[PDB]
Amino acid sequence: SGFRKMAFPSGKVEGCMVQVTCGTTTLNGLWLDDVVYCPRHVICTSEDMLNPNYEDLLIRKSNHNFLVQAGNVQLRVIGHSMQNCVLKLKVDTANPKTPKYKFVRIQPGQTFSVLACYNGSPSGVYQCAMRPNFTIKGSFLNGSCGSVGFNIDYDCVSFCYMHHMELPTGVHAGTDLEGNFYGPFVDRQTAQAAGTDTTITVNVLAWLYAAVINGDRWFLNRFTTTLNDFNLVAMKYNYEPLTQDHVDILGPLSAQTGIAVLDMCASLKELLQNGMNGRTILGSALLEDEFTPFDVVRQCSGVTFQ
Amino acid sequence: SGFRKMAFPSGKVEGCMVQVTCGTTTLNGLWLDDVVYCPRHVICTSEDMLNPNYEDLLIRKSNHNFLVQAGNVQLRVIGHSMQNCVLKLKVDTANPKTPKYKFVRIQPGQTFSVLACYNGSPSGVYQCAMRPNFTIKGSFLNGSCGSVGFNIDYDCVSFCYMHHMELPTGVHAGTDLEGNFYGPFVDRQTAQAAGTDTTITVNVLAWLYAAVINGDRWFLNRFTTTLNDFNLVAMKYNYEPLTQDHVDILGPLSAQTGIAVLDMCASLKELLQNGMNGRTILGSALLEDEFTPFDVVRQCSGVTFQ
Ligand SMILES: *C(=O)[C@H](C[C@@H]1CCCNC1=O)NC(=O)[C@H](CC(C)C)NC(=O)[C@@H](NC(=O)C1CCCCC1)C(C)C
Ligand SMILES: *C(=O)[C@H](C[C@@H]1CCCNC1=O)NC(=O)[C@H](CC(C)C)NC(=O)[C@@H](NC(=O)C1CCCCC1)C(C)C
Known part of the structure; x- marks a missing residue:
């Protein structure tokens, strides 16, 4: 008996976390096959996040400007593209720890496990729920962006969330792995109103x-x-x-x-x-x-x- | 910001979980190097647990009586010994996923992560605390015995708990990885009083x-x-x-x-x-x-x- 807030085992996701550095900004990336997914504001400076022109910032970046490290081994980027709010960095090495995975967009009220990471290294795992106002009540510090939310079905990891920002209310907003935000949020440091929450x-x-x-x-x-x-x-x-x-x-x-x-x-x-x-x-x-x-x-x- | 009940990443422990079957009783084992650790009551029948004679039950068992399976591959047992309340099954294959590990006996009030497993497969991970009365408030069903509690320090997994039994109060008791129970409990199905709990x-x-x-x-x-x-x-x-x-x-x-x-x-x-x-x-x-x-x-x- 007993009932506890239980999260999925994180072993399959742990083998996919890498560190993505672009200039000063360092955050986490999701290394699946030969593609590394990470929030696009990694190409931003602190002054850019007030009103960033992401396409203009990315055009000034070439493949070598992205430092991707998996543990102590550096991965070479051989191509970069922006899909909505996420960057897709093609690396020359395919992740041998890539599990069977799926990109899903969850509905409000559904739950998933978050693997909080910093500098590409896991810090902890906890269970979250997509609130009706398309936010989550997580635990994220500076450098946690790129941490992903996931569910495990049999042997397939269903990636459904990637962390992008925190609102001063204390809640967090992010995207699916296709770069589309959950809710009416945008990845810029400006006033954005989150709707009132509701009990599921x-x-x-x-x-x-x-x-x-x-x-x-x-x-x-x-x-x-x-x-x-x-x-x-x-x-x-x-x-x-x-x-x-x-x-x-x-x-x-x-x-x-x-x-x-x-x-x-x-x-x-x-x-x-x-x-x-x-x-x-x-x-x-x-x-x-x-x-x-x-x-x-x-x-x-x-x-x-x- | 934000604060959540956070558990350690379970990837290093996931690679050590195996299924241990002895007759009808199947539970989980901890495969470290060439040794599999599991609760000793795996050699018990339902009628034995009322007052089991573990040494007598084990003497009637030989190495082939223990079916150890890691995923879909069966591990051959080439030796068995009983250390307090845990069995140590020497297998002919050393676990290639064995991380740097340590056997520690925690103090009351300390916390650790539990990887709940069934048939050697992980079900979920959650954070627990060793109560002052040497119990834990976990989530365990039939077949969960052998699930371990652990902490991660840098790169070393500190195994500190292995699940053994549940008390009708709803709480759970277990041992360290040396087979010594936490508290005045014994691995037999008889009345055992747990002391009153206290707030840490x-x-x-x-x-x-x-x-x-x-x-x-x-x-x-x-x-x-x-x-x-x-x-x-x-x-x-x-x-x-x-x-x-x-x-x-x-x-x-x-x-x-x-x-x-x-x-x-x-x-x-x-x-x-x-x-x-x-x-x-x-x-x-x-x-x-x-x-x-x-x-x-x-x-x-x-x-x-x-
Ligand atoms: C990425 O690593 C980082 C994680 C944040 C920052 C640290 C605090 N907790 C987190 O989850 N994200 C990040 O810095 C965001 C970059 C985007 C602008 C692209 N910025 C923010 O999350 C900032 N939040 C806001 O500006 C809100 C947005 C809508 C309401 C007004 C304020 C934080 C406050 C730095
Ligand atoms: C092992 O897999 C199993 C896990 C238990 C059983 C299922 C319920 N939740 C769990 O954690 N352990 C197990 O069966 C124990 C075997 C020992 C006797 C060696 N048995 C128990 O946990 C039983 N509990 C008791 O008998 C208590 C002991 C002290 C107070 C009186 C009752 C349960 C109730 C089957």
């Missing part, structure tokens, strides 16, 4: 199901509710509306616990309107919304990866 | 320092306190006493924030006696005690590993 309701319900599987059942009440009446209450507390698709995704958890989804919604409705009265659920005094139903079933059934 | 005070203070570094400063009050008067209040709320050694360990965090340790203790004293009044610190409504001062400085300074 289907993830809270999945977390409550995990609590039942682990023996934390005090919050279960004797009532049921309709999907419409639940969403009217959840909307009041800044919860996303629960769709029938979300009810279907919670199917596996509902059958394992014998608790209908609308019955669990009735318990969540009482938790929102009355609070916890100083009690905890799975060791938390707040409702957790960064566990997908797939995360819950994977941890509660022991799904492994190759 | 120096870790809470380190967590409050992390909050200040990340801009969460509302809890800082204008008062100071003595080390003795703080421990009298902390004892009332089941906090471990703060020693001068703990004050010295908090030195780096105190100098970075300019907040004396006894000043932060005065703020923690007010938090304990008055609560948070519905407010959060680093997104938590409860005080976190599973971050060491070393964990805080590593995440707040970006320490990497080879």
